[PDB]
């Protein structure tokens, strides 16, 4: 029941948080997820042909 | 969770006392003792991992056939393909150079 | 502890001159949801290995049990 | 694009050991951890393995060099004088 | 220890055999003043420390 409530968004406020933001969810893990999503999207777009290799490369560096 | 134990009288986490947890047909968790993994044989010239040669412990190599331990090329199970090719090219090239230098020395001695 | 693929292999194994006991095990497995069939496992016990031939055809299994020599000890269970 | 004004790689030592000693260590640590040209393959792949060992990761060649540089000034000067003496001997 | 040597195990066997009380009939033997085993041992009381 508490897991269902926490899914719904309860019991996660500032009084319920006892560890730092990085201790709870590492910024490194968040960045890894973000960069992998972006790189996968760029690779898929290039393989589909929606962008060419040069735009893919500049966007890869931007990401 | 069911907890396991060493099957040998060695109670220490030494490199020869590694265990895994496995499920047995009796439905309980047991400790299976694992042996040390085998490292790939290396080339004697360049030192890279030899391909086409199986990875076994040294005595384990005695029970396998000859094909599993070598490649059909010269220096097969000893040196890699690139190093064998490099030493073939080297041998031919510098023996030809030896002939050239011998001829040039003889002709300069004749000139002298 | 060793599979057999072909009936010819089974026949050479059964005449290998060191096998004397065959065990026939019946497994009532399922191939499709509404078709539970009768699978037969012929286990020839050699000196070093236990060879097992899987047969999904009841007719093939019957002809196998009939064609193996009657001198070899067959045990159906 | 610079997180430290002047300590560089010696920010790992914090405030310890004294600024002058940290400055000397900074100089020699930049040299020791730098990457050098390989005179054999022409690529920046030469790293220090230990004091004196300089291994090119691409042509798989080990070189004997300085403790913190692939080549010291004393070594270059000695090579120059040995070349001069060799050519004087040969000719 | 579990992993013993045969010398230690032989000493263990000898100690176990020696650790027994007086047979009743030696008491009745004539001119006898022995009443019990005075060399009796318990594993907690005295260690043979071999």
């Amino acid at each position: 029941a508490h897991a269902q409530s926490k899914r719904e968004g309860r019991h996660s406020g500032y009084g319920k948080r006892k560890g730092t933001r990085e201790a709870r969810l590492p910024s490194q893990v968040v960045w890894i997820r973000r960069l992998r999503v972006l790189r996968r999207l760029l690779a898929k777009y290039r393989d589909a042909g929606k962008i060419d290799k040069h735009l893919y490369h500049v966007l890869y560096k931007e990401s | 969770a069911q907890r396991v134990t060493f099957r040998r009288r060695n109670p220490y986490n030494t490199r020869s006392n590694k265990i895994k947890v496995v499920k047995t047909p009796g439905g309980i968790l047991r400790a299976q003792h694992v042996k040390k993994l085998a490292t790939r044989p290396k080339c004697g010239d360049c030192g890279s991992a030899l391909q086409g040669i199986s990875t076994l412990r040294p005595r384990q190599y005695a029970t396998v056939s000859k094909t599993h331990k070598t490649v059909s090329r010269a220096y097969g199970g000893s040196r890699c393909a690139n190093c064998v090719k490099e030493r073939i090219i080297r041998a031919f090239l510098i023996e030809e150079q030896k002939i050239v230098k011998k001829v040039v020395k003889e002709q300069t001695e004749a000139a002298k | 502890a060793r599979e057999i693929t072909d009936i010819k292999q089974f026949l050479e194994l059964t005449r290998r001159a060191d096998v004397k006991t065959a065990t026939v095990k019946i497994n009532k497995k399922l191939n499709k949801a509404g078709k539970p069939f009768r699978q037969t496992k012929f286990k020839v016990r050699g000196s070093s290995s236990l060879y097992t031939l899987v047969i999904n055809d009841a007719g093939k299994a019957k002809k196998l049990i009939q064609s193996l020599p009657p001198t070899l000890k067959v045990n159906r269970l | 694009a610079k997180r430290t004004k002047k300590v560089g790689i010696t920010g790992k030592y914090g405030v310890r050991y004294g600024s002058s000693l940290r400055r000397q260590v900074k100089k020699l640590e930049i040299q020791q951890h730098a990457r050098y040209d390989c005179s054999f393959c022409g690529k920046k792949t030469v790293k220090r393995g230990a004091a004196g060992i300089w291994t090119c990761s691409c042509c798989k060649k080990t070189v004997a060099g300085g403790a913190y540089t692939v080549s010291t000034a004393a070594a270059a000067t000695v090579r120059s004088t040995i070349r001069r003496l060799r050519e004087m001997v040969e000719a | 220890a579990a992993q013993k040597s045969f010398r230690i195990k032989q000493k263990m066997a000898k100690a176990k055999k020696q650790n027994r009380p007086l047979p009743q009939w030696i008491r009745l033997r004539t001119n006898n003043t022995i009443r019990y085993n005075a060399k009796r041992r318990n594993w907690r009381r005295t260690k043979m420390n071999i």
Binding site: - | - | - | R16, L21, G52, I53, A64, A67, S71 | -
Partner: protein, 251 residues
């Protein structure tokens, strides 16, 4: 009193060198026939770090001249030596870095290292990282090469004494501050048990000539005679002078 630390260091109980991780004694090739009449070509197989040694060592493989064999010699690597390099050792060897010419065959002003003190001892002088020997002169009559040692001393060696051309690799090592008792600990952990060093003034009089007192002071002159004995020789042994001197190499 008591037997002091420098006296205890000669029994070699805990003070012997830690030689497990070492790579063998670094010695020149045995002076057989080729080294003194012609040359022999060996190949540098690997250059390795030797524990307790600042200089890298070079393993060089030579062909056995009298039998079908390969002989692996352990050399002190000179700066510029690399794997796959050909080393030439002998009287007829050429003046190149890594070669093992005799002193009589090298000219004046040559930089040499791993030099033999007597012909055949397989290397005695200029073996620490960055160190070298200068060839000052020759005396062909009763062949004697004069050299300058890393300390500045002038030495007269036989002209048949071998030596490797160049300087020793690993130079400039002592230019880096250790910064740490930890770095000193890891340095000496595989040299020998000589660190840390307690001062004699911080001991008791039983433990050292300097120990004792209500203040930490030596008490008597710290310059000790050369004729002193063990237990007395603690301090500045046979010091000609003391104090901070403004001076140069003077050599």
């Amino acid at each position: 009193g008591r037997v002091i630390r420098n006296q205890r260091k000669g029994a070699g109980s805990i003070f012997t060198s830690h030689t497990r991780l070492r790579q063998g004694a670094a010695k020149l090739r045995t002076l057989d026939y080729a080294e003194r009449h012609g040359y022999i070509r060996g190949i540098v197989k690997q250059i390795v770090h030797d524990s307790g040694r600042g200089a890298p060592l070079a393993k060089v493989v030579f062909r056995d001249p009298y039998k079908y064999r390969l002989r692996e010699e352990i050399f002190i690597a000179n700066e510029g030596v690399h794997t796959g390099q050909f080393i030439y050792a002998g009287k007829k060897a050429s003046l190149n870095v890594g070669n093992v010419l005799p002193l009589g065959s090298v000219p004046e002003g040559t930089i040499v290292s791993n030099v033999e003190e007597k012909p055949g001892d397989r290397g005695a002088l200029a073996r620490a990282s960055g160190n070298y020997v200068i060839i000052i002169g020759h005396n062909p009559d009763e062949n004697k090469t004069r050299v300058r040692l890393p300390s500045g001393a002038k030495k007269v060696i036989s002209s048949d004494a071998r030596g490797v051309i160049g300087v020793i690799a690993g130079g400039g090592r002592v230019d880096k501050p250790l910064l740490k008792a930890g770095r000193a600990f890891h340095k000496y952990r595989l040299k020998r048990n000589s660190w840390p060093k307690t001062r004699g003034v911080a001991m008791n009089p039983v433990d050292h000539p300097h120990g004792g007192g209500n203040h930490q002071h030596i008490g008597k002159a710290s310059t000790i005679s050369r004729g002193a004995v063990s237990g007395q020789k603690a301090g500045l042994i046979a010091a000609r002078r003391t104090g901070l001197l403004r001076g140069s190499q003077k050599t």
